[PDB]
Design a protein around this nucleic acid. Structure first.
Ligand SMILES: *C(=O)C[C@H]1C[C@@H](C)C(=O)/C=C/C(C)=C/[C@H](CO[C@@H]2O[C@H](C)[C@@H](O)[C@@H](OC)[C@H]2OC)[C@@H](CC)OC(=O)C[C@@H](O)[C@H](C)[C@H]1O[C@@H]1O[C@H](C)[C@@H](O[C@H]2C[C@@](C)(O)[C@@H](O)[C@H](C)O2)[C@H](N(C)C)[C@H]1O
Ligand SMILES: [Mg+2]
Ligand SMILES: [Mg+2]
Ligand SMILES: [Mg+2]
Ligand SMILES: [Mg+2]
Ligand SMILES: [Mg+2]
Ligand SMILES: [Mg+2]
Ligand SMILES: [Mg+2]
Ligand SMILES: [Mg+2]
Ligand SMILES: [Mg+2]
Ligand SMILES: [Mg+2]
Ligand SMILES: [Mg+2]
Ligand SMILES: [Mg+2]
Ligand SMILES: [Mg+2]
Ligand SMILES: [Mg+2]
Ligand SMILES: [Mg+2]
Ligand SMILES: [Mg+2]
Ligand SMILES: [Mg+2]
Ligand SMILES: [Mg+2]
Ligand SMILES: [Mg+2]
Ligand SMILES: [Mg+2]
Ligand SMILES: [Mg+2]
Ligand SMILES: [Mg+2]
Ligand SMILES: [Mg+2]
Ligand SMILES: [Mg+2]
Ligand SMILES: [Mg+2]
Ligand SMILES: [Mg+2]
Ligand SMILES: [Mg+2]
Ligand SMILES: [Mg+2]
Ligand SMILES: [Mg+2]
Ligand SMILES: [Mg+2]
Ligand SMILES: [Mg+2]
Ligand SMILES: [Mg+2]
Ligand SMILES: [Mg+2]
Ligand SMILES: [Mg+2]
Ligand SMILES: [Mg+2]
Ligand SMILES: [Mg+2]
Ligand SMILES: [Mg+2]
Ligand SMILES: [Mg+2]
Ligand SMILES: [Mg+2]
Ligand SMILES: [Mg+2]
Ligand SMILES: [Mg+2]
Ligand SMILES: [Mg+2]
Ligand SMILES: [Mg+2]
Ligand SMILES: [Mg+2]
Ligand SMILES: [Mg+2]
Ligand SMILES: [Mg+2]
Ligand SMILES: [Mg+2]
Ligand SMILES: [Mg+2]
Ligand SMILES: [Mg+2]
Ligand SMILES: [Mg+2]
Ligand SMILES: [Mg+2]
Ligand SMILES: [Mg+2]
Ligand SMILES: [Mg+2]
Ligand SMILES: [Mg+2]
Ligand SMILES: [Mg+2]
Ligand SMILES: [Mg+2]
Ligand SMILES: [Mg+2]
Ligand SMILES: [Mg+2]
Ligand SMILES: [Mg+2]
Ligand SMILES: [Mg+2]
Ligand SMILES: [Mg+2]
Ligand SMILES: [Mg+2]
Ligand SMILES: [Mg+2]
Ligand SMILES: [Mg+2]
Ligand SMILES: [Mg+2]
Ligand SMILES: [Mg+2]
Ligand SMILES: [Mg+2]
Ligand SMILES: [Mg+2]
Ligand SMILES: [Mg+2]
Ligand SMILES: [Mg+2]
Ligand SMILES: [Mg+2]
Ligand SMILES: [Mg+2]
Ligand SMILES: [Mg+2]
Ligand SMILES: [Mg+2]
Ligand SMILES: [Mg+2]
Ligand SMILES: [Mg+2]
Ligand SMILES: [Mg+2]
Ligand SMILES: [Mg+2]
Ligand SMILES: [Mg+2]
Ligand SMILES: [Mg+2]
Ligand SMILES: [Mg+2]
Ligand SMILES: [Mg+2]
Ligand SMILES: [Mg+2]
Ligand SMILES: [Mg+2]
Ligand SMILES: [Mg+2]
Ligand SMILES: [Mg+2]
Ligand SMILES: [Mg+2]
Ligand SMILES: [Mg+2]
Ligand SMILES: [Mg+2]
Ligand SMILES: [Mg+2]
Ligand SMILES: [Mg+2]
Ligand SMILES: [Mg+2]
Ligand SMILES: [Mg+2]
Ligand SMILES: [Mg+2]
Ligand SMILES: [Mg+2]
Ligand SMILES: [Mg+2]
Ligand SMILES: [Mg+2]
Ligand SMILES: [Mg+2]
Ligand SMILES: [Mg+2]
Ligand SMILES: [Mg+2]
Ligand SMILES: [Mg+2]
Ligand SMILES: [Mg+2]
Ligand SMILES: [Mg+2]
Ligand SMILES: [Mg+2]
Ligand SMILES: [Mg+2]
Ligand SMILES: [Mg+2]
Ligand SMILES: [Mg+2]
Ligand SMILES: [Mg+2]
Ligand SMILES: [Mg+2]
Ligand SMILES: [Mg+2]
Ligand SMILES: [Mg+2]
Ligand SMILES: [Mg+2]
Ligand SMILES: [Mg+2]
Ligand SMILES: [Mg+2]
Ligand SMILES: [Mg+2]
Ligand SMILES: [Mg+2]
Ligand SMILES: [Mg+2]
Ligand SMILES: [Mg+2]
Ligand SMILES: [Mg+2]
Ligand SMILES: [Mg+2]
Ligand SMILES: [Mg+2]
Ligand SMILES: [Mg+2]
Ligand SMILES: [Mg+2]
Ligand SMILES: [Mg+2]
Ligand SMILES: [Mg+2]
Ligand SMILES: [Mg+2]
Ligand SMILES: [Mg+2]
Ligand SMILES: [Mg+2]
Ligand SMILES: [Mg+2]
Ligand SMILES: [Mg+2]
Ligand SMILES: [Mg+2]
Ligand SMILES: [Mg+2]
Ligand SMILES: [Mg+2]
Ligand SMILES: [Mg+2]
Ligand SMILES: [Mg+2]
Ligand SMILES: [Mg+2]
Ligand SMILES: [Mg+2]
Ligand SMILES: [Mg+2]
Ligand SMILES: [Mg+2]
Ligand SMILES: [Mg+2]
Ligand SMILES: [Mg+2]
Ligand SMILES: [Mg+2]
Ligand SMILES: [Mg+2]
Ligand SMILES: [Mg+2]
Ligand SMILES: [Mg+2]
Ligand SMILES: [Mg+2]
Ligand SMILES: [Mg+2]
Ligand SMILES: [Mg+2]
Ligand SMILES: [Mg+2]
Ligand SMILES: [Mg+2]
Ligand SMILES: [Mg+2]
Ligand SMILES: [Mg+2]
Ligand SMILES: [Mg+2]
Ligand SMILES: [Mg+2]
Ligand SMILES: [Mg+2]
Ligand SMILES: [Mg+2]
Ligand SMILES: [Mg+2]
Ligand SMILES: [Mg+2]
Ligand SMILES: [Mg+2]
Ligand SMILES: [Mg+2]
Ligand SMILES: [Mg+2]
Ligand SMILES: [Mg+2]
Ligand SMILES: [Mg+2]
Ligand SMILES: [Mg+2]
Ligand SMILES: [Mg+2]
Ligand SMILES: [Mg+2]
Ligand SMILES: [Mg+2]
Ligand SMILES: [Mg+2]
Ligand SMILES: [Mg+2]
Ligand SMILES: [Mg+2]
Ligand SMILES: [Mg+2]
Ligand SMILES: [Mg+2]
Ligand SMILES: [Mg+2]
Ligand SMILES: [Mg+2]
Ligand SMILES: [Mg+2]
Ligand SMILES: [Mg+2]
Ligand SMILES: [Mg+2]
Ligand SMILES: [Mg+2]
Ligand SMILES: [Mg+2]
Ligand SMILES: [Mg+2]
Ligand SMILES: [Mg+2]
Ligand SMILES: [Mg+2]
Ligand SMILES: [Mg+2]
Ligand SMILES: [Mg+2]
Ligand SMILES: [Mg+2]
Ligand SMILES: [Mg+2]
Ligand SMILES: [Mg+2]
Ligand SMILES: [Mg+2]
Ligand SMILES: [Mg+2]
Ligand SMILES: [Mg+2]
Ligand SMILES: [Mg+2]
Ligand SMILES: [Mg+2]
Ligand SMILES: [Mg+2]
Ligand SMILES: [Mg+2]
Ligand SMILES: [Mg+2]
Ligand SMILES: [Mg+2]
Ligand SMILES: [Mg+2]
Ligand SMILES: [Mg+2]
Ligand SMILES: [Mg+2]
Ligand SMILES: [Mg+2]
Ligand SMILES: [Mg+2]
Ligand SMILES: [Mg+2]
Ligand SMILES: [Mg+2]
Ligand SMILES: [Mg+2]
Ligand SMILES: [Mg+2]
Ligand SMILES: [Mg+2]
Ligand SMILES: [Mg+2]
Ligand SMILES: [Mg+2]
Ligand SMILES: [Mg+2]
Ligand SMILES: [Mg+2]
Ligand SMILES: [Mg+2]
Ligand SMILES: [Mg+2]
Ligand SMILES: [Mg+2]
Ligand SMILES: [Mg+2]
Ligand SMILES: [Mg+2]
Ligand SMILES: [Mg+2]
Ligand SMILES: [Mg+2]
Ligand SMILES: [Mg+2]
Ligand SMILES: [Mg+2]
Ligand SMILES: [Mg+2]
Ligand SMILES: [Mg+2]
Ligand SMILES: [Mg+2]
Ligand SMILES: [Mg+2]
Ligand SMILES: [Mg+2]
Ligand SMILES: [Mg+2]
Ligand SMILES: [Mg+2]
Ligand SMILES: [Mg+2]
Ligand SMILES: [Mg+2]
Ligand SMILES: [Mg+2]
Ligand SMILES: [Mg+2]
Ligand SMILES: [Mg+2]
Ligand SMILES: [Mg+2]
Ligand SMILES: [Mg+2]
Ligand SMILES: [Mg+2]
Ligand SMILES: [Mg+2]
Ligand SMILES: [Mg+2]
Ligand SMILES: [Mg+2]
Ligand SMILES: [Mg+2]
Ligand SMILES: [Mg+2]
Ligand SMILES: [Mg+2]
Ligand SMILES: [Mg+2]
Ligand SMILES: [Mg+2]
Ligand SMILES: [Mg+2]
Ligand SMILES: [Mg+2]
Ligand SMILES: [Mg+2]
Ligand SMILES: [Mg+2]
Lengths: 275, 48
RNA sequence: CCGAGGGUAGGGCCCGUGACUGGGGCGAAGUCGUAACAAGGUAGCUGUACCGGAAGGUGCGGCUGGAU
RNA sequence: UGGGAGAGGGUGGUGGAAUUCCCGGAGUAGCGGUGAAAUGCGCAGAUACCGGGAGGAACGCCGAUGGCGAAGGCAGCCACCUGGUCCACCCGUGACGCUGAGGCGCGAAAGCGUGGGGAGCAAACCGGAUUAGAUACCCGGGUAGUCCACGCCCUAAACG
RNA sequence: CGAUGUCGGCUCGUCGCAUCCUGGGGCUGAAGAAGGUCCCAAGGGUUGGGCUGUUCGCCCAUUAAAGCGGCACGCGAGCUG
RNA sequence: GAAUGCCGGCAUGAGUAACGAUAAAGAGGGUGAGAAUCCCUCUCGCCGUAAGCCCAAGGGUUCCUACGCAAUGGUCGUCAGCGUAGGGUUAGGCGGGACCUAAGGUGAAGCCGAAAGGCGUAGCCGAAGGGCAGCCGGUUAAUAUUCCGGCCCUUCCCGCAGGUGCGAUGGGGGGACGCUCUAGGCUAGGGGGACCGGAGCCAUGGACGAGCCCGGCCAGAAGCGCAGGGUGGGAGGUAGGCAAAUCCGCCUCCCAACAAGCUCUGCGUGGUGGGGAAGCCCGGGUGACAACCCCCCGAAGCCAGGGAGCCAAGAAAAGCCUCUAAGCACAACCUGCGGGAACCCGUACCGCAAACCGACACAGGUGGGCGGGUGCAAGAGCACUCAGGCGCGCGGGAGAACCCUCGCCAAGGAACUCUGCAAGUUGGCCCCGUAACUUCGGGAGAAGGGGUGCUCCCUGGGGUGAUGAGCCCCGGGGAGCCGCAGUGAACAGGCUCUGGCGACUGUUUACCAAAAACACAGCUCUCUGCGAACUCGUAAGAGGAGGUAUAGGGAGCGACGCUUGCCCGGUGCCGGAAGGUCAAGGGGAGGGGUGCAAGCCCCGAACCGAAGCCCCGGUGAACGGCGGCCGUAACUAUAACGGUCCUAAGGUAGCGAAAUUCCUUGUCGGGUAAGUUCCGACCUGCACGAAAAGCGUAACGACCGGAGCGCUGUCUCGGCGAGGGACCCGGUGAAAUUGAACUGGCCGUGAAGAUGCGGCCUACCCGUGGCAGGACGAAAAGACCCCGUGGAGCUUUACUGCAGCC
RNA sequence: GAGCUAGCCCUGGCCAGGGUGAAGCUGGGGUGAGACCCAGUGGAGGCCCGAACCGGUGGGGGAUGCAAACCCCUCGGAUGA
């Protein structure tokens, strides 16, 4: 339930902010934070390799448990649900009956006080991680490993999910958040349910400074530059594109496919995406 | 207005100093050149 | 002190009038089509929506005040 | 108090038929469509047939001249939550009633906002015919919409 | 072209006369008054405003009249821009 | 003898401009060869959120003293940041190092690169961040938290005593964190006192007073007091914190829990040690046995790691504490006490500036702290002043034009002009009051108006204290007084109506453009399944991202509202296992050379053989494109209607003489006395039109039009006045420019605009203040134009390559 | 060569005073319960006025300057991109 503001400034007119209603703890676990080295889009050469990055709020990185097969069979209590600025989803603090503490990304509907567990024997309940092969077909699932023991790669953003379509040998078939149909190995882990904070996508930033807070520096259009800068630079007055619309580096940017031709994972993509 | 020379002893030694020059092929040719020319000073004076 | 009234400024209602513009009523014998009345030749009407020189057409749902 | 019938309403599940699409097999010279045709689709292997898969929507027979609701309206099946109503008994209250300007709520379809969803259908739109024309009727396509959630709109041959 | 600053305005004048007014004339299809046309005449004079960068022009209100041209389309080591 | 030649020297312009903020000077007395300029005194003026004071950087002896005045100093100079010499900087506690980590840098491992080198985990380095022990006064010509005095404190070594399972680079805890708002209690700092201390003072009409003037504190260990911060205690279980663990984490039990207790800071007091004015007298000495007390205001600082709220979610590591491991428990650690030990570098001076950055003793630039008082509603604003510091390193006269900065102006009031450019006006606060429209916030300080000083009287509430007095902060009523005028000085909106553009706050061409340009939230298309796409790199490696389609890249459009039509023939992109073409390679019909021959060698047809292209489809918020001629209605005119040619399809809604309209000042209407602009309309749109978006839109704008009111020196049309210059005198003394010059007018002539030629006219020699017509005046080898088989940036379906990708 | 300038990274600092008065909270009203209305409290914002600070709108001066971009008046931002 995104929160609105009354129009008492020009920008407050449209700005919306998250309700933060699921959050139950407002300072991170000291033993699970570590400093996040802001890059500004600069690589080890010092060169900008991703334009328009930099200048956002300072952040600490919360270490997230993307394996969970670390701790097969050991139950844990959901101690709190907190804000994480490094991702769109909320995170859940887990108190394992081990004494060990860990963060996972918080699925939708997960309640403080419940217990979650990971392993082949786990109940098909929101928050439990199982190898893909042991989850019944049809089950909506998130934080899915792409390869066994390599870490949860898919469906981690707020509100996303994957759905199990069927099984074929050592592989289960997932419908990813993009609508792609892909085979993922059955020994890959995944967590029952969809990621929470689904209302994330209905946030109206509201003003330019709000983008500055997230580390997004202004994006300048190619049509606004000169020919030394961009395929769309120049012209007297305004100008249509005047050529197939291109990126700063010349490649076409309205339809040109760019997935590598002979990539080995093609044998595992069943059907490209949608809409 | 603010002009271009804004002296800074650390900046000066870290940029043109003897050790900066020795750390780099082009920097060593500089020293080799200024010795061959007979410069009294191979490197900018800076009081540290 | 109040005080006819005069002055300054800003409002409310009404009336007349205005380049141009909207449709309306009326007008013996104009131009285009033929929508409706027969199953009117696609049953008609209907609220709405979109479209078309025009009457209209079409979609969705509704009515019989529809014929056989 | 004791019972009854019912597509009355809301929520969560879930079943089979059919259409479309995709995959695999088999198979070949047409399929489709109309008053007749053409557009379209088809030897880059369509139609027709089998097995497999995905998805959306609507629930055949029962079904009726039937039932329920105040009206709009409500039809697979299951559970939960909930309204109205009828009958029996003649037990309780003791006229506590009727109507109802305003008010408030509900209110088919289309339409609108924000997300979703999208099989079939189909305003707009394109093509093929027909025709003097044909911004129609008929044929091939086809986008909103039709579907879900929340919020609007508040209309009707909302009729007995 | 080893640079002659280029429109208009403002300021400051000066000159020509093919004369707008004022002075003197002849002819008139000059009754008078008022005009028309030509001749002589450059002494002086020849307004304020609305519009436009404007020159020019149109318009308003006047006037004896609201002249036309030259001076590097007079005048930026005088100003404006 | 010429090259705007080169190096040097010296001229001209010229005793000319200038002498660097218009804060400002006058006199007396010294010194000295010499004095507007040095020293001293008195008077005057200027700064005072600085033009005072303290840090940091940078500078590097400029500091202090004596002796100097050639040059430096915009004049002068006896003076000086100048010359010569001598002197001067003192630390266990201040700052840095022998401590820690940040970005970043470096880099055993390892990775990569022709070479040079590029990466890179740990580790190391790296600070204005973390951590860490000194306060007050005195003293020097010049240093002082450094020397001295008083009172405090830290670490290391050794010893004594008491205690304890001691022990670490290892585990854990802690360190440890945002933004805005903010509580209680204090301190800094300040105001007042009829109280306390003081040299004195009574003037010129009055005052010997509850008179005037000055001052009334600072530091402090333990202890104690006040106000805060931090912190649960015990037991049992335990599989986690990469060994161990009694620690930490997790579970259960009991108890303590708005507490308490323990601990730690701040403030107060505190033995003690200091300080101590005006005035007078010569920095000192007195004052002085100085006094050192009460009331109030009160922080943005302190208690602090305090509290609340919010979303954009807010360093690390050491010190410190705890846990144990080897080890060792004659050790070792902890606590108390004692003695001893305690190194290196900086320290002068300037520091919003004459010592730093600007070539200058340059009106510019330079981070942090303190920054008093009164009044003006507040304040760091403004005026005047404290402490303190200055009068800006040429002066003296005069009182022209003209220039700058400033003041006033009769009558008029935008008539000025491209334009009200500029300058008026308005101006703070309190109260009354306030329109269209609107996204319901706004528009709004709309507009417009009233009040504002002083005296007396009555009086309400808040803070302090005690509830009172006193102090203090906000008021309320009544009656008066004075002036032209009461935010009496200073600081402080002119307003309205109506268009265009852009939603808005923002951003930009450092040094001619601040805008309608860029950005912007938002909308759409498109790519990307993760070793992502994409970007930098030869690579390794990075960024993307310790992210994962509600995400990341690319493109266009640009809040919001209502919308965004038709064309896929061409280009692009997407799809298509067929067909066509297609390179190397395979294949080897058939040839050729050579040899006696076996053979060796060469050519080579059919045929098999990718991407690409061809071909078949799709696709517009992909590149783009969206007709012509002729006829037609019962007045005329016009043409709903029709005919025909063409196209891939012939521009829809909306808007329109427009930031677009050539003809054009279109035509009509409005406003004006008059309107090429403006506004409203019309539509033959030269040449609008739907995300290079179309049409609107409240609010917003140092944007650009048009109008009105107010008010004005803008103007009719100028006048006067002020100061800084200009002018004269003393001092110092440039510049561009310059073939040489004994350098007039007219009419001609001449390479076509003559001081210089011809003819005539005019004209004694030389200056000073002024004006700009000429010297085709100066400046810059025209920046326009052209030429050169000159150059460079940019483009593409120009040529040819290369990266990249297939 | 990034001691100027542009962007980013790390670590610190700074922003007088005044004005407006969002959400929420509380109380009251209202209702079947609600929505909602009123008052108080509260203190939000690329909010308003205005110093420091950051700018550089218009005009004037300056143009061998005080200055190879300055000076005066005026003007923009000033809790935020
Ligand atoms: C072209 O620019 C040449 C220029 C003359 C040269 C000598 C030159 O550059 C002069 C510069 C000057 C006098 C600068 C003055 C100082 O400005 C200030 O300088 C300081 C250092 C700086 O910090 C700033 O101070 C704040 C800076 O302020 C801007 C400056 C003061 C305004 O003066 C000028 O700018 C004048 C300059 O324009 C000067 C007059 C120029 O000469 C003219 O050059 C043009 C090109 C030429 O005219 C052309 C125009 C055409 C081509 O259309 C054509 O019609 C004409 C015929 O030629 C003109 N002349 C006609 C030849 C020259 O006079
Ligand atoms: Mg809102
Ligand atoms: Mg609202
Ligand atoms: Mg949440
Ligand atoms: Mg940590
Ligand atoms: Mg990184
Ligand atoms: Mg690196
Ligand atoms: Mg990029
Ligand atoms: Mg970047
Ligand atoms: Mg993310
Ligand atoms: Mg989150
Ligand atoms: Mg797999
Ligand atoms: Mg979104
Ligand atoms: Mg952020
Ligand atoms: Mg942009
Ligand atoms: Mg451009
Ligand atoms: Mg450009
Ligand atoms: Mg470039
Ligand atoms: Mg290029
Ligand atoms: Mg290019
Ligand atoms: Mg272009
Ligand atoms: Mg162009
Ligand atoms: Mg352009
Ligand atoms: Mg153009
Ligand atoms: Mg451009
Ligand atoms: Mg083009
Ligand atoms: Mg291109
Ligand atoms: Mg590519
Ligand atoms: Mg896909
Ligand atoms: Mg600068
Ligand atoms: Mg600097
Ligand atoms: Mg330094
Ligand atoms: Mg330094
Ligand atoms: Mg440095
Ligand atoms: Mg370096
Ligand atoms: Mg060095
Ligand atoms: Mg080398
Ligand atoms: Mg070498
Ligand atoms: Mg030497
Ligand atoms: Mg040397
Ligand atoms: Mg060197
Ligand atoms: Mg009267
Ligand atoms: Mg009909
Ligand atoms: Mg009919
Ligand atoms: Mg019909
Ligand atoms: Mg139709
Ligand atoms: Mg076929
Ligand atoms: Mg075949
Ligand atoms: Mg589907
Ligand atoms: Mg019934
Ligand atoms: Mg009874
Ligand atoms: Mg309805
Ligand atoms: Mg026909
Ligand atoms: Mg020329
Ligand atoms: Mg010359
Ligand atoms: Mg010249
Ligand atoms: Mg004039
Ligand atoms: Mg005359
Ligand atoms: Mg002319
Ligand atoms: Mg004209
Ligand atoms: Mg006359
Ligand atoms: Mg003339
Ligand atoms: Mg001419
Ligand atoms: Mg001409
Ligand atoms: Mg001229
Ligand atoms: Mg001229
Ligand atoms: Mg000029
Ligand atoms: Mg001129
Ligand atoms: Mg000239
Ligand atoms: Mg001149
Ligand atoms: Mg001249
Ligand atoms: Mg101009
Ligand atoms: Mg010669
Ligand atoms: Mg020369
Ligand atoms: Mg030369
Ligand atoms: Mg020379
Ligand atoms: Mg020379
Ligand atoms: Mg010389
Ligand atoms: Mg010599
Ligand atoms: Mg000389
Ligand atoms: Mg001379
Ligand atoms: Mg002279
Ligand atoms: Mg001069
Ligand atoms: Mg000078
Ligand atoms: Mg000078
Ligand atoms: Mg001054
Ligand atoms: Mg005197
Ligand atoms: Mg004197
Ligand atoms: Mg002197
Ligand atoms: Mg002297
Ligand atoms: Mg003096
Ligand atoms: Mg003196
Ligand atoms: Mg005197
Ligand atoms: Mg003061
Ligand atoms: Mg001297
Ligand atoms: Mg001298
Ligand atoms: Mg000497
Ligand atoms: Mg000198
Ligand atoms: Mg000087
Ligand atoms: Mg002497
Ligand atoms: Mg010294
Ligand atoms: Mg000491
Ligand atoms: Mg040592
Ligand atoms: Mg280092
Ligand atoms: Mg440090
Ligand atoms: Mg220290
Ligand atoms: Mg101390
Ligand atoms: Mg001292
Ligand atoms: Mg112990
Ligand atoms: Mg912490
Ligand atoms: Mg932290
Ligand atoms: Mg910190
Ligand atoms: Mg905040
Ligand atoms: Mg104190
Ligand atoms: Mg005070
Ligand atoms: Mg235990
Ligand atoms: Mg254990
Ligand atoms: Mg004393
Ligand atoms: Mg004594
Ligand atoms: Mg502060
Ligand atoms: Mg604190
Ligand atoms: Mg670290
Ligand atoms: Mg042992
Ligand atoms: Mg032993
Ligand atoms: Mg040592
Ligand atoms: Mg010192
Ligand atoms: Mg300054
Ligand atoms: Mg400072
Ligand atoms: Mg100084
Ligand atoms: Mg000076
Ligand atoms: Mg200076
Ligand atoms: Mg002050
Ligand atoms: Mg004081
Ligand atoms: Mg005030
Ligand atoms: Mg302050
Ligand atoms: Mg002075
Ligand atoms: Mg000064
Ligand atoms: Mg001076
Ligand atoms: Mg004089
Ligand atoms: Mg002045
Ligand atoms: Mg007067
Ligand atoms: Mg006057
Ligand atoms: Mg007026
Ligand atoms: Mg007037
Ligand atoms: Mg005017
Ligand atoms: Mg104007
Ligand atoms: Mg102008
Ligand atoms: Mg004022
Ligand atoms: Mg109005
Ligand atoms: Mg109003
Ligand atoms: Mg208005
Ligand atoms: Mg309006
Ligand atoms: Mg309103
Ligand atoms: Mg007012
Ligand atoms: Mg008001
Ligand atoms: Mg009053
Ligand atoms: Mg008075
Ligand atoms: Mg009076
Ligand atoms: Mg104001
Ligand atoms: Mg703007
Ligand atoms: Mg703009
Ligand atoms: Mg716009
Ligand atoms: Mg807008
Ligand atoms: Mg916008
Ligand atoms: Mg702003
Ligand atoms: Mg420029
Ligand atoms: Mg500029
Ligand atoms: Mg420049
Ligand atoms: Mg511009
Ligand atoms: Mg601006
Ligand atoms: Mg721009
Ligand atoms: Mg914008
Ligand atoms: Mg938009
Ligand atoms: Mg989208
Ligand atoms: Mg690259
Ligand atoms: Mg290489
Ligand atoms: Mg990373
Ligand atoms: Mg833009
Ligand atoms: Mg609207
Ligand atoms: Mg096309
Ligand atoms: Mg096509
Ligand atoms: Mg195409
Ligand atoms: Mg085309
Ligand atoms: Mg349309
Ligand atoms: Mg028009
Ligand atoms: Mg017109
Ligand atoms: Mg227009
Ligand atoms: Mg046009
Ligand atoms: Mg025109
Ligand atoms: Mg024109
Ligand atoms: Mg006209
Ligand atoms: Mg008119
Ligand atoms: Mg104009
Ligand atoms: Mg027309
Ligand atoms: Mg375009
Ligand atoms: Mg355009
Ligand atoms: Mg507006
Ligand atoms: Mg603006
Ligand atoms: Mg603006
Ligand atoms: Mg006006
Ligand atoms: Mg004047
Ligand atoms: Mg004067
Ligand atoms: Mg004389
Ligand atoms: Mg002299
Ligand atoms: Mg001299
Ligand atoms: Mg000569
Ligand atoms: Mg001569
Ligand atoms: Mg002469
Ligand atoms: Mg002469
Ligand atoms: Mg000639
Ligand atoms: Mg001549
Ligand atoms: Mg002559
Ligand atoms: Mg001669
Ligand atoms: Mg001759
Ligand atoms: Mg001659
Ligand atoms: Mg002669
Ligand atoms: Mg003569
Ligand atoms: Mg003279
Ligand atoms: Mg003169
Ligand atoms: Mg002249
Ligand atoms: Mg001349
Ligand atoms: Mg010449
Ligand atoms: Mg000349
Ligand atoms: Mg040359
Ligand atoms: Mg030339
Ligand atoms: Mg040139
Ligand atoms: Mg140029
Ligand atoms: Mg030419
Ligand atoms: Mg050529
Ligand atoms: Mg040639
Ligand atoms: Mg060439
Ligand atoms: Mg190459
Ligand atoms: Mg920098
Ligand atoms: Mg630096
Ligand atoms: Mg501020
Ligand atoms: Mg404040
Ligand atoms: Mg107020
Ligand atoms: Mg309030
Ligand atoms: Mg609250
Ligand atoms: Mg603001
Ligand atoms: Mg205000
Ligand atoms: Mg001005
Ligand atoms: Mg200035
Ligand atoms: Mg000013
Ligand atoms: Mg402001
Ligand atoms: Mg402020
Ligand atoms: Mg902030």
């Amino acid at each position: 339930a995104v929160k609105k503001f009354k129009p008492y400034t020009p920008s407050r007119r449209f700005m919306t902010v998250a309700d933060f209603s699921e959050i139950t703890k407002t300072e991170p676990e000291k033993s699970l934070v570590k400093p996040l080295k802001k890059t500004g889009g600069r690589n080890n050469q010092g060169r900008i390799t991703v334009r328009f990055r930099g200048g956002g709020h300072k952040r600490l990185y919360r270490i997230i448990d993307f394996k969970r097969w670390d701790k097969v069979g050991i139950p844990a209590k959901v101690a709190a649900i907190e804000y994480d600025p490094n991702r769109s989803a909320r995170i859940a603090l887990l108190h394992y009956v081990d004494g060990e503490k860990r963060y996972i990304i918080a699925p939708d509907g997960l309640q403080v006080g419940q217990q979650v567990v990971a392993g082949p024997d786990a109940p098909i309940q929101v928050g439990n991680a199982l190898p893909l092969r042991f989850i019944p077909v049809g089950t909506v699932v998130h934080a899915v490993e792409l390869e066994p023991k390599k870490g949860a790669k898919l469906a981690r953003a707020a509100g996303t999910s994957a759905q199990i379509q069927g099984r074929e040998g050592d592989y289960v078939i997932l419908r990813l958040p993009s609508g792609e149909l892909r085979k993922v190995h059955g020994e890959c882990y995944a967590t029952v349910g969809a990621v929470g904070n689904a209302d994330h996508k209905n946030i109206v930033l509201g003003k330019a400074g709000r983008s500055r807070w997230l580390g997004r520096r202004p994006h300048v259009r190619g049509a606004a530059m000169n020919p030394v800068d961009h395929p769309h630079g120049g012209g007297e007055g305004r100008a249509p594109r005047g050529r197939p619309p291109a990126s700063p580096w010349g490649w076409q940017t309205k339809g040109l496919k760019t997935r590598k031709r002979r990539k080995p994972s093609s044998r595992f993509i069943i059907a490209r995406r949608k809409k | 207005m603010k002009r271009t020379w804004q002296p800074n002893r650390r900046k000066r030694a870290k940029t043109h100093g003897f050790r900066a020059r020795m750390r780099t092929p082009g920097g060593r040719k500089v020293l080799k050149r200024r010795r061959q020319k007979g410069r009294w000073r191979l490197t900018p004076a800076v009081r540290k």
